[PDB]
PDB file of N, CA and C in Angstrom:
ATOM      1  N   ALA A 162      92.665  14.774  67.916  1.00 61.24           N
ATOM      2  CA  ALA A 162      92.172  15.724  66.924  1.00 61.24           C
ATOM      3  C   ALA A 162      90.769  16.211  67.271  1.00 61.24           C
ATOM      4  N   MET A 163      89.917  15.315  67.772  1.00 63.36           N
ATOM      5  CA  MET A 163      88.554  15.704  68.125  1.00 63.36           C
ATOM      6  C   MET A 163      88.519  16.629  69.338  1.00 63.36           C
ATOM      7  N   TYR A 164      89.308  16.329  70.370  1.00 65.49           N
ATOM      8  CA  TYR A 164      89.120  16.957  71.670  1.00 65.49           C
ATOM      9  C   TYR A 164      90.316  17.747  72.186  1.00 65.49           C
ATOM     10  N   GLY A 165      91.475  17.670  71.539  1.00 66.05           N
ATOM     11  CA  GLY A 165      92.591  18.532  71.868  1.00 66.05           C
ATOM     12  C   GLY A 165      93.387  18.068  73.076  1.00 66.05           C
ATOM     13  N   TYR A 166      94.456  18.809  73.355  1.00 64.69           N
ATOM     14  CA  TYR A 166      95.368  18.511  74.448  1.00 64.69           C
ATOM     15  C   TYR A 166      94.907  19.170  75.745  1.00 64.69           C
ATOM     16  N   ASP A 167      95.581  18.809  76.835  1.00 63.90           N
ATOM     17  CA  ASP A 167      95.420  19.520  78.094  1.00 63.90           C
ATOM     18  C   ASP A 167      96.018  20.919  77.999  1.00 63.90           C
ATOM     19  N   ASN A 168      95.479  21.831  78.809  1.00 60.35           N
ATOM     20  CA  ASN A 168      95.887  23.232  78.761  1.00 60.35           C
ATOM     21  C   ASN A 168      97.354  23.441  79.125  1.00 60.35           C
ATOM     22  N   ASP A 169      97.987  22.481  79.795  1.00 58.53           N
ATOM     23  CA  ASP A 169      99.389  22.594  80.174  1.00 58.53           C
ATOM     24  C   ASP A 169     100.330  21.866  79.222  1.00 58.53           C
ATOM     25  N   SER A 170      99.815  21.308  78.131  1.00 57.71           N
ATOM     26  CA  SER A 170     100.654  20.581  77.190  1.00 57.71           C
ATOM     27  C   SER A 170     101.558  21.531  76.416  1.00 57.71           C
ATOM     28  N   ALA A 171     102.789  21.088  76.162  1.00 60.17           N
ATOM     29  CA  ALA A 171     103.677  21.844  75.288  1.00 60.17           C
ATOM     30  C   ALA A 171     103.189  21.852  73.846  1.00 60.17           C
ATOM     31  N   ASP A 172     102.412  20.848  73.445  1.00 60.88           N
ATOM     32  CA  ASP A 172     101.903  20.719  72.087  1.00 60.88           C
ATOM     33  C   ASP A 172     100.469  21.207  71.939  1.00 60.88           C
ATOM     34  N   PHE A 173     100.000  22.071  72.840  1.00 64.18           N
ATOM     35  CA  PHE A 173      98.587  22.432  72.877  1.00 64.18           C
ATOM     36  C   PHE A 173      98.113  23.027  71.557  1.00 64.18           C
ATOM     37  N   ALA A 174      98.912  23.916  70.967  1.00 66.18           N
ATOM     38  CA  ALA A 174      98.478  24.643  69.779  1.00 66.18           C
ATOM     39  C   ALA A 174      98.416  23.771  68.531  1.00 66.18           C
ATOM     40  N   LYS A 175      98.979  22.563  68.569  1.00 61.27           N
ATOM     41  CA  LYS A 175      99.082  21.756  67.358  1.00 61.27           C
ATOM     42  C   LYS A 175      97.751  21.166  66.908  1.00 61.27           C
ATOM     43  N   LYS A 176      96.790  20.975  67.810  1.00 61.56           N
ATOM     44  CA  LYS A 176      95.511  20.354  67.462  1.00 61.56           C
ATOM     45  C   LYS A 176      94.354  21.131  68.079  1.00 61.56           C
ATOM     46  N   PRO A 177      93.857  22.155  67.392  1.00 62.22           N
ATOM     47  CA  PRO A 177      92.623  22.820  67.833  1.00 62.22           C
ATOM     48  C   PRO A 177      91.447  21.864  67.759  1.00 62.22           C
ATOM     49  N   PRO A 178      90.733  21.661  68.867  1.00 62.78           N
ATOM     50  CA  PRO A 178      89.740  20.578  68.920  1.00 62.78           C
ATOM     51  C   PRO A 178      88.599  20.807  67.940  1.00 62.78           C
ATOM     52  N   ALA A 179      88.347  19.802  67.099  1.00 64.24           N
ATOM     53  CA  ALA A 179      87.225  19.873  66.173  1.00 64.24           C
ATOM     54  C   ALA A 179      85.887  19.923  66.896  1.00 64.24           C
ATOM     55  N   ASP A 180      85.805  19.374  68.110  1.00 63.91           N
ATOM     56  CA  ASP A 180      84.600  19.527  68.915  1.00 63.91           C
ATOM     57  C   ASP A 180      84.333  20.985  69.269  1.00 63.91           C
ATOM     58  N   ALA A 181      85.364  21.830  69.255  1.00 63.47           N
ATOM     59  CA  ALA A 181      85.171  23.256  69.483  1.00 63.47           C
ATOM     60  C   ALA A 181      84.999  24.014  68.172  1.00 63.47           C
ATOM     61  N   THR A 182      85.864  23.754  67.193  1.00 60.41           N
ATOM     62  CA  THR A 182      85.870  24.524  65.955  1.00 60.41           C
ATOM     63  C   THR A 182      84.907  23.994  64.903  1.00 60.41           C
ATOM     64  N   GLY A 183      84.620  22.697  64.904  1.00 61.36           N
ATOM     65  CA  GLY A 183      83.868  22.124  63.811  1.00 61.36           C
ATOM     66  C   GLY A 183      84.640  21.996  62.520  1.00 61.36           C
ATOM     67  N   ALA A 184      85.968  22.020  62.577  1.00 63.25           N
ATOM     68  CA  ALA A 184      86.782  21.922  61.378  1.00 63.25           C
ATOM     69  C   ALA A 184      86.895  20.474  60.909  1.00 63.25           C
ATOM     70  N   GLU A 185      87.344  20.317  59.668  1.00 66.86           N
ATOM     71  CA  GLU A 185      87.456  19.001  59.055  1.00 66.86           C
ATOM     72  C   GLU A 185      88.685  18.257  59.569  1.00 66.86           C
ATOM     73  N   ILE A 186      88.565  16.936  59.664  1.00 66.08           N
ATOM     74  CA  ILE A 186      89.648  16.053  60.089  1.00 66.08           C
ATOM     75  C   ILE A 186      89.918  15.054  58.971  1.00 66.08           C
ATOM     76  N   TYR A 187      91.192  14.781  58.706  1.00 66.45           N
ATOM     77  CA  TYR A 187      91.566  13.781  57.712  1.00 66.45           C
ATOM     78  C   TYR A 187      91.540  12.389  58.335  1.00 66.45           C
ATOM     79  N   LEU A 188      90.915  11.439  57.645  1.00 69.40           N
ATOM     80  CA  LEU A 188      90.979  10.041  58.049  1.00 69.40           C
ATOM     81  C   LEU A 188      92.101   9.330  57.301  1.00 69.40           C
ATOM     82  N   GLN A 189      92.718   8.343  57.955  1.00 71.09           N
ATOM     83  CA  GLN A 189      93.886   7.676  57.397  1.00 71.09           C
ATOM     84  C   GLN A 189      93.806   6.153  57.380  1.00 71.09           C
ATOM     85  N   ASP A 190      92.698   5.557  57.805  1.00 68.64           N
ATOM     86  CA  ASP A 190      92.568   4.109  57.935  1.00 68.64           C
ATOM     87  C   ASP A 190      91.607   3.607  56.865  1.00 68.64           C
ATOM     88  N   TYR A 191      92.079   2.705  56.006  1.00 65.57           N
ATOM     89  CA  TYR A 191      91.348   2.323  54.806  1.00 65.57           C
ATOM     90  C   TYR A 191      91.174   0.813  54.717  1.00 65.57           C
ATOM     91  N   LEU A 192      90.031   0.399  54.174  1.00 62.60           N
ATOM     92  CA  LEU A 192      89.739  -1.016  53.991  1.00 62.60           C
ATOM     93  C   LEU A 192      90.755  -1.663  53.058  1.00 62.60           C
ATOM     94  N   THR A 193      91.299  -2.801  53.485  1.00 62.52           N
ATOM     95  CA  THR A 193      92.333  -3.520  52.751  1.00 62.52           C
ATOM     96  C   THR A 193      91.935  -4.984  52.647  1.00 62.52           C
ATOM     97  N   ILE A 194      92.044  -5.552  51.449  1.00 62.42           N
ATOM     98  CA  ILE A 194      91.655  -6.933  51.181  1.00 62.42           C
ATOM     99  C   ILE A 194      92.919  -7.762  50.992  1.00 62.42           C
ATOM    100  N   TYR A 195      93.016  -8.875  51.710  1.00 58.29           N
ATOM    101  CA  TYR A 195      94.195  -9.725  51.657  1.00 58.29           C
ATOM    102  C   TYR A 195      93.917 -11.019  50.903  1.00 58.29           C
ATOM    103  N   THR A 196      94.978 -11.582  50.332  1.00 59.16           N
ATOM    104  CA  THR A 196      94.966 -12.928  49.782  1.00 59.16           C
ATOM    105  C   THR A 196      96.361 -13.513  49.946  1.00 59.16           C
ATOM    106  N   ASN A 197      96.442 -14.838  49.876  1.00 60.10           N
ATOM    107  CA  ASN A 197      97.693 -15.523  50.174  1.00 60.10           C
ATOM    108  C   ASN A 197      98.740 -15.255  49.099  1.00 60.10           C
ATOM    109  N   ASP A 198      99.997 -15.205  49.523  1.00 60.95           N
ATOM    110  CA  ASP A 198     101.141 -15.084  48.628  1.00 60.95           C
ATOM    111  C   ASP A 198     101.799 -16.456  48.543  1.00 60.95           C
ATOM    112  N   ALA A 199     101.660 -17.110  47.393  1.00 62.12           N
ATOM    113  CA  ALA A 199     102.155 -18.464  47.194  1.00 62.12           C
ATOM    114  C   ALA A 199     103.496 -18.510  46.479  1.00 62.12           C
ATOM    115  N   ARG A 200     104.208 -17.385  46.400  1.00 59.92           N
ATOM    116  CA  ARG A 200     105.479 -17.356  45.683  1.00 59.92           C
ATOM    117  C   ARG A 200     106.492 -18.310  46.308  1.00 59.92           C
ATOM    118  N   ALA A 201     106.511 -18.401  47.635  1.00 61.56           N
ATOM    119  CA  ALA A 201     107.441 -19.269  48.343  1.00 61.56           C
ATOM    120  C   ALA A 201     106.772 -20.494  48.951  1.00 61.56           C
ATOM    121  N   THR A 202     105.507 -20.746  48.635  1.00 60.65           N
ATOM    122  CA  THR A 202     104.783 -21.863  49.228  1.00 60.65           C
ATOM    123  C   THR A 202     105.246 -23.177  48.607  1.00 60.65           C
ATOM    124  N   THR A 203     105.553 -24.156  49.453  1.00 62.06           N
ATOM    125  CA  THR A 203     105.956 -25.476  48.994  1.00 62.06           C
ATOM    126  C   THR A 203     104.783 -26.444  49.102  1.00 62.06           C
ATOM    127  N   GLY A 204     104.770 -27.436  48.216  1.00 65.09           N
ATOM    128  CA  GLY A 204     103.651 -28.358  48.197  1.00 65.09           C
ATOM    129  C   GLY A 204     102.479 -27.801  47.405  1.00 65.09           C
ATOM    130  N   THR A 205     101.274 -28.120  47.867  1.00 65.77           N
ATOM    131  CA  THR A 205     100.059 -27.720  47.165  1.00 65.77           C
ATOM    132  C   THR A 205      99.800 -26.234  47.388  1.00 65.77           C
ATOM    133  N   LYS A 206      99.642 -25.491  46.298  1.00 66.81           N
ATOM    134  CA  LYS A 206      99.383 -24.063  46.383  1.00 66.81           C
ATOM    135  C   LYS A 206      97.900 -23.774  46.202  1.00 66.81           C
ATOM    136  N   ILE A 207      97.414 -22.762  46.910  1.00 66.04           N
ATOM    137  CA  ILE A 207      96.084 -22.219  46.668  1.00 66.04           C
ATOM    138  C   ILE A 207      96.253 -21.022  45.738  1.00 66.04           C
ATOM    139  N   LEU A 208      95.711 -21.130  44.530  1.00 67.76           N
ATOM    140  CA  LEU A 208      95.893 -20.105  43.510  1.00 67.76           C
ATOM    141  C   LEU A 208      94.550 -19.510  43.107  1.00 67.76           C
ATOM    142  N   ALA A 209      93.740 -19.138  44.096  1.00 71.09           N
ATOM    143  CA  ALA A 209      92.396 -18.639  43.836  1.00 71.09           C
ATOM    144  C   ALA A 209      92.344 -17.143  43.545  1.00 71.09           C
ATOM    145  N   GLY A 210      93.460 -16.429  43.647  1.00 67.80           N
ATOM    146  CA  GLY A 210      93.439 -14.998  43.376  1.00 67.80           C
ATOM    147  C   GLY A 210      92.821 -14.220  44.523  1.00 67.80           C
ATOM    148  N   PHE A 211      91.887 -13.338  44.194  1.00 65.94           N
ATOM    149  CA  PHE A 211      91.181 -12.504  45.154  1.00 65.94           C
ATOM    150  C   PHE A 211      89.700 -12.847  45.186  1.00 65.94           C
ATOM    151  N   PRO A 212      89.014 -12.556  46.292  1.00 67.45           N
ATOM    152  CA  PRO A 212      87.557 -12.553  46.251  1.00 67.45           C
ATOM    153  C   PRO A 212      87.055 -11.337  45.495  1.00 67.45           C
ATOM    154  N   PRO A 213      85.945 -11.459  44.777  1.00 64.94           N
ATOM    155  CA  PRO A 213      85.417 -10.301  44.044  1.00 64.94           C
ATOM    156  C   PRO A 213      84.716  -9.316  44.967  1.00 64.94           C
ATOM    157  N   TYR A 214      85.491  -8.512  45.700  1.00 64.54           N
ATOM    158  CA  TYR A 214      84.910  -7.722  46.781  1.00 64.54           C
ATOM    159  C   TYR A 214      84.001  -6.612  46.266  1.00 64.54           C
ATOM    160  N   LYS A 215      84.148  -6.209  44.999  1.00 64.77           N
ATOM    161  CA  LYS A 215      83.263  -5.184  44.453  1.00 64.77           C
ATOM    162  C   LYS A 215      81.805  -5.618  44.463  1.00 64.77           C
TER     163      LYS A 215
ATOM    164  N   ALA B   1      29.473  76.496  82.027  1.00 65.13           N
ATOM    165  CA  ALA B   1      29.996  77.850  81.890  1.00 65.13           C
ATOM    166  C   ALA B   1      31.169  77.885  80.918  1.00 65.13           C
ATOM    167  N   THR B   2      31.229  78.950  80.128  1.00 65.96           N
ATOM    168  CA  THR B   2      32.287  79.101  79.140  1.00 65.96           C
ATOM    169  C   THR B   2      33.635  79.285  79.827  1.00 65.96           C
ATOM    170  N   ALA B   3      34.631  78.535  79.371  1.00 66.96           N
ATOM    171  CA  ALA B   3      35.969  78.600  79.937  1.00 66.96           C
ATOM    172  C   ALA B   3      36.838  79.491  79.063  1.00 66.96           C
ATOM    173  N   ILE B   4      37.302  80.608  79.627  1.00 68.42           N
ATOM    174  CA  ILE B   4      38.218  81.474  78.898  1.00 68.42           C
ATOM    175  C   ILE B   4      39.651  80.954  78.958  1.00 68.42           C
ATOM    176  N   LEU B   5      40.000  80.174  79.977  1.00 67.04           N
ATOM    177  CA  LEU B   5      41.301  79.527  80.059  1.00 67.04           C
ATOM    178  C   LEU B   5      41.124  78.066  80.444  1.00 67.04           C
ATOM    179  N   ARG B   6      41.939  77.214  79.833  1.00 67.27           N
ATOM    180  CA  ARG B   6      42.014  75.797  80.146  1.00 67.27           C
ATOM    181  C   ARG B   6      43.471  75.407  80.335  1.00 67.27           C
ATOM    182  N   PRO B   7      43.746  74.362  81.114  1.00 69.62           N
ATOM    183  CA  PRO B   7      45.143  73.984  81.361  1.00 69.62           C
ATOM    184  C   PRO B   7      45.794  73.300  80.170  1.00 69.62           C
ATOM    185  N   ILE B   8      46.193  74.082  79.164  1.00 66.64           N
ATOM    186  CA  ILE B   8      46.871  73.523  78.000  1.00 66.64           C
ATOM    187  C   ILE B   8      48.274  73.027  78.328  1.00 66.64           C
ATOM    188  N   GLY B   9      48.870  73.499  79.421  1.00 67.32           N
ATOM    189  CA  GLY B   9      50.201  73.059  79.806  1.00 67.32           C
ATOM    190  C   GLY B   9      51.317  73.705  78.991  1.00 67.32           C
ATOM    191  N   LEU B  10      52.503  73.107  79.099  1.00 68.64           N
ATOM    192  CA  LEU B  10      53.682  73.594  78.391  1.00 68.64           C
ATOM    193  C   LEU B  10      53.609  73.401  76.887  1.00 68.64           C
ATOM    194  N   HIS B  11      54.364  74.242  76.194  1.00 72.42           N
ATOM    195  CA  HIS B  11      54.693  74.032  74.796  1.00 72.42           C
ATOM    196  C   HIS B  11      55.998  73.248  74.726  1.00 72.42           C
ATOM    197  N   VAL B  12      55.929  72.028  74.206  1.00 74.61           N
ATOM    198  CA  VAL B  12      57.097  71.179  74.015  1.00 74.61           C
ATOM    199  C   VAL B  12      57.079  70.684  72.579  1.00 74.61           C
ATOM    200  N   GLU B  13      58.206  70.814  71.891  1.00 76.19           N
ATOM    201  CA  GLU B  13      58.334  70.354  70.517  1.00 76.19           C
ATOM    202  C   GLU B  13      59.209  69.109  70.487  1.00 76.19           C
ATOM    203  N   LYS B  14      58.711  68.058  69.846  1.00 75.72           N
ATOM    204  CA  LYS B  14      59.407  66.784  69.729  1.00 75.72           C
ATOM    205  C   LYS B  14      59.875  66.603  68.293  1.00 75.72           C
ATOM    206  N   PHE B  15      61.117  66.161  68.123  1.00 75.42           N
ATOM    207  CA  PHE B  15      61.731  66.035  66.808  1.00 75.42           C
ATOM    208  C   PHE B  15      62.268  64.622  66.636  1.00 75.42           C
ATOM    209  N   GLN B  16      61.775  63.922  65.622  1.00 78.01           N
ATOM    210  CA  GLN B  16      62.234  62.581  65.289  1.00 78.01           C
ATOM    211  C   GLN B  16      63.105  62.640  64.041  1.00 78.01           C
ATOM    212  N   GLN B  17      64.243  61.952  64.081  1.00 76.14           N
ATOM    213  CA  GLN B  17      65.179  61.910  62.968  1.00 76.14           C
ATOM    214  C   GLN B  17      65.574  60.468  62.681  1.00 76.14           C
ATOM    215  N   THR B  18      65.883  60.185  61.419  1.00 78.18           N
ATOM    216  CA  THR B  18      66.243  58.848  60.966  1.00 78.18           C
ATOM    217  C   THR B  18      67.546  58.916  60.182  1.00 78.18           C
ATOM    218  N   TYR B  19      68.439  57.965  60.436  1.00 77.02           N
ATOM    219  CA  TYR B  19      69.742  57.902  59.788  1.00 77.02           C
ATOM    220  C   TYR B  19      69.924  56.529  59.154  1.00 77.02           C
ATOM    221  N   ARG B  20      70.224  56.509  57.857  1.00 76.89           N
ATOM    222  CA  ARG B  20      70.388  55.277  57.100  1.00 76.89           C
ATOM    223  C   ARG B  20      71.765  55.235  56.451  1.00 76.89           C
ATOM    224  N   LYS B  21      72.350  54.042  56.413  1.00 75.91           N
ATOM    225  CA  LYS B  21      73.584  53.799  55.683  1.00 75.91           C
ATOM    226  C   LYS B  21      73.519  52.423  55.041  1.00 75.91           C
ATOM    227  N   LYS B  22      74.277  52.252  53.964  1.00 78.01           N
ATOM    228  CA  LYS B  22      74.464  50.957  53.329  1.00 78.01           C
ATOM    229  C   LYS B  22      75.953  50.706  53.158  1.00 78.01           C
ATOM    230  N   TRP B  23      76.429  49.585  53.688  1.00 76.92           N
ATOM    231  CA  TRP B  23      77.839  49.230  53.643  1.00 76.92           C
ATOM    232  C   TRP B  23      78.017  47.871  52.982  1.00 76.92           C
ATOM    233  N   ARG B  24      79.138  47.708  52.285  1.00 77.57           N
ATOM    234  CA  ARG B  24      79.528  46.427  51.710  1.00 77.57           C
ATOM    235  C   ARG B  24      80.884  46.038  52.279  1.00 77.57           C
ATOM    236  N   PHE B  25      80.938  44.885  52.933  1.00 75.18           N
ATOM    237  CA  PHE B  25      82.096  44.458  53.704  1.00 75.18           C
ATOM    238  C   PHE B  25      82.688  43.191  53.107  1.00 75.18           C
ATOM    239  N   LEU B  26      84.012  43.107  53.109  1.00 74.09           N
ATOM    240  CA  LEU B  26      84.731  41.912  52.693  1.00 74.09           C
ATOM    241  C   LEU B  26      85.397  41.283  53.909  1.00 74.09           C
ATOM    242  N   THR B  27      85.209  39.980  54.076  1.00 71.72           N
ATOM    243  CA  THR B  27      85.777  39.241  55.194  1.00 71.72           C
ATOM    244  C   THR B  27      86.679  38.137  54.667  1.00 71.72           C
ATOM    245  N   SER B  28      87.718  37.821  55.430  1.00 73.72           N
ATOM    246  CA  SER B  28      88.649  36.765  55.067  1.00 73.72           C
ATOM    247  C   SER B  28      88.275  35.480  55.795  1.00 73.72           C
ATOM    248  N   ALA B  29      88.381  34.351  55.095  1.00 69.72           N
ATOM    249  CA  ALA B  29      88.046  33.058  55.680  1.00 69.72           C
ATOM    250  C   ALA B  29      89.214  32.503  56.484  1.00 69.72           C
ATOM    251  N   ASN B  30      89.412  33.029  57.691  1.00 69.20           N
ATOM    252  CA  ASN B  30      90.579  32.676  58.489  1.00 69.20           C
ATOM    253  C   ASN B  30      90.517  31.233  58.965  1.00 69.20           C
ATOM    254  N   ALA B  31      91.687  30.613  59.059  1.00 69.83           N
ATOM    255  CA  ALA B  31      91.791  29.302  59.679  1.00 69.83           C
ATOM    256  C   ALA B  31      91.579  29.412  61.183  1.00 69.83           C
ATOM    257  N   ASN B  32      90.997  28.370  61.769  1.00 68.32           N
ATOM    258  CA  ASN B  32      90.889  28.263  63.220  1.00 68.32           C
ATOM    259  C   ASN B  32      92.183  27.661  63.756  1.00 68.32           C
ATOM    260  N   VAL B  33      93.057  28.501  64.307  1.00 67.60           N
ATOM    261  CA  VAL B  33      94.328  28.058  64.864  1.00 67.60           C
ATOM    262  C   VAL B  33      94.435  28.560  66.296  1.00 67.60           C
ATOM    263  N   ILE B  34      95.409  28.020  67.020  1.00 67.76           N
ATOM    264  CA  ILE B  34      95.630  28.373  68.416  1.00 67.76           C
ATOM    265  C   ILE B  34      96.876  29.240  68.515  1.00 67.76           C
ATOM    266  N   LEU B  35      96.721  30.419  69.106  1.00 67.12           N
ATOM    267  CA  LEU B  35      97.814  31.349  69.338  1.00 67.12           C
ATOM    268  C   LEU B  35      98.030  31.511  70.835  1.00 67.12           C
ATOM    269  N   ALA B  36      99.289  31.615  71.238  1.00 64.72           N
ATOM    270  CA  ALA B  36      99.618  31.854  72.634  1.00 64.72           C
ATOM    271  C   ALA B  36      99.712  33.351  72.894  1.00 64.72           C
ATOM    272  N   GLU B  37      99.032  33.813  73.936  1.00 68.12           N
ATOM    273  CA  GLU B  37      99.114  35.200  74.376  1.00 68.12           C
ATOM    274  C   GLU B  37      99.760  35.205  75.755  1.00 68.12           C
ATOM    275  N   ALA B  38     100.948  35.794  75.846  1.00 66.25           N
ATOM    276  CA  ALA B  38     101.721  35.762  77.077  1.00 66.25           C
ATOM    277  C   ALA B  38     101.091  36.650  78.146  1.00 66.25           C
ATOM    278  N   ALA B  39     101.422  36.347  79.398  1.00 67.65           N
ATOM    279  CA  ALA B  39     100.914  37.124  80.519  1.00 67.65           C
ATOM    280  C   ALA B  39     101.476  38.539  80.492  1.00 67.65           C
ATOM    281  N   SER B  40     100.658  39.496  80.924  1.00 65.11           N
ATOM    282  CA  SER B  40     101.037  40.907  80.891  1.00 65.11           C
ATOM    283  C   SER B  40     100.226  41.630  81.956  1.00 65.11           C
ATOM    284  N   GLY B  41     100.885  42.034  83.039  1.00 66.64           N
ATOM    285  CA  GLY B  41     100.183  42.720  84.111  1.00 66.64           C
ATOM    286  C   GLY B  41      99.145  41.821  84.752  1.00 66.64           C
ATOM    287  N   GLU B  42      97.899  42.293  84.773  1.00 65.78           N
ATOM    288  CA  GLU B  42      96.787  41.500  85.274  1.00 65.78           C
ATOM    289  C   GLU B  42      96.272  40.488  84.260  1.00 65.78           C
ATOM    290  N   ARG B  43      96.755  40.523  83.025  1.00 65.26           N
ATOM    291  CA  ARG B  43      96.313  39.562  82.021  1.00 65.26           C
ATOM    292  C   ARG B  43      97.077  38.256  82.185  1.00 65.26           C
ATOM    293  N   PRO B  44      96.406  37.139  82.446  1.00 66.01           N
ATOM    294  CA  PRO B  44      97.120  35.869  82.591  1.00 66.01           C
ATOM    295  C   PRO B  44      97.507  35.300  81.237  1.00 66.01           C
ATOM    296  N   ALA B  45      98.479  34.392  81.262  1.00 68.12           N
ATOM    297  CA  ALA B  45      98.833  33.658  80.056  1.00 68.12           C
ATOM    298  C   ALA B  45      97.645  32.821  79.607  1.00 68.12           C
ATOM    299  N   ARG B  46      97.347  32.864  78.312  1.00 70.07           N
ATOM    300  CA  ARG B  46      96.158  32.193  77.816  1.00 70.07           C
ATOM    301  C   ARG B  46      96.378  31.739  76.382  1.00 70.07           C
ATOM    302  N   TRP B  47      95.541  30.801  75.959  1.00 69.27           N
ATOM    303  CA  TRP B  47      95.488  30.343  74.581  1.00 69.27           C
ATOM    304  C   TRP B  47      94.336  31.037  73.872  1.00 69.27           C
ATOM    305  N   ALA B  48      94.537  31.363  72.601  1.00 70.31           N
ATOM    306  CA  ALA B  48      93.526  32.027  71.793  1.00 70.31           C
ATOM    307  C   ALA B  48      93.223  31.181  70.566  1.00 70.31           C
ATOM    308  N   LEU B  49      91.939  31.021  70.265  1.00 69.27           N
ATOM    309  CA  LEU B  49      91.477  30.245  69.122  1.00 69.27           C
ATOM    310  C   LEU B  49      90.845  31.200  68.116  1.00 69.27           C
ATOM    311  N   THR B  50      91.417  31.266  66.918  1.00 67.72           N
ATOM    312  CA  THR B  50      91.005  32.256  65.934  1.00 67.72           C
ATOM    313  C   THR B  50      89.802  31.767  65.132  1.00 67.72           C
ATOM    314  N   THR B  51      89.077  32.721  64.549  1.00 69.54           N
ATOM    315  CA  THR B  51      87.970  32.428  63.645  1.00 69.54           C
ATOM    316  C   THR B  51      87.986  33.419  62.491  1.00 69.54           C
ATOM    317  N   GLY B  52      87.089  33.193  61.538  1.00 71.05           N
ATOM    318  CA  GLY B  52      86.813  34.114  60.460  1.00 71.05           C
ATOM    319  C   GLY B  52      85.534  34.906  60.604  1.00 71.05           C
ATOM    320  N   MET B  53      84.923  34.906  61.787  1.00 71.88           N
ATOM    321  CA  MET B  53      83.651  35.589  62.024  1.00 71.88           C
ATOM    322  C   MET B  53      83.928  37.051  62.360  1.00 71.88           C
ATOM    323  N   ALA B  54      83.791  37.913  61.356  1.00 69.73           N
ATOM    324  CA  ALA B  54      84.111  39.323  61.521  1.00 69.73           C
ATOM    325  C   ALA B  54      83.059  40.034  62.362  1.00 69.73           C
TER     326      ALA B  54
END
């Protein structure tokens, strides 16, 4: 998306390089917080919920 | 000594003119996209990147 395809690519027109145009790009990778799923855990369970990430 | 003739030179008339206009233009905010322009005669096949800069 930033720099575009090679001039001989069949898909050249699909991504006009933002380094040339200065156009906006959508980001798709987002911070995700995990915690254990104890629904099927046998024995001693850790039931601490989530960390207070806020 | 009194001069009855002096080198006044040619008679040349100079004319200055000024032209003014006021225009109001509307432009469209075009997307920056890539268009293919096929080869034609001496014109090679090329990619074109559009703008809204009128």
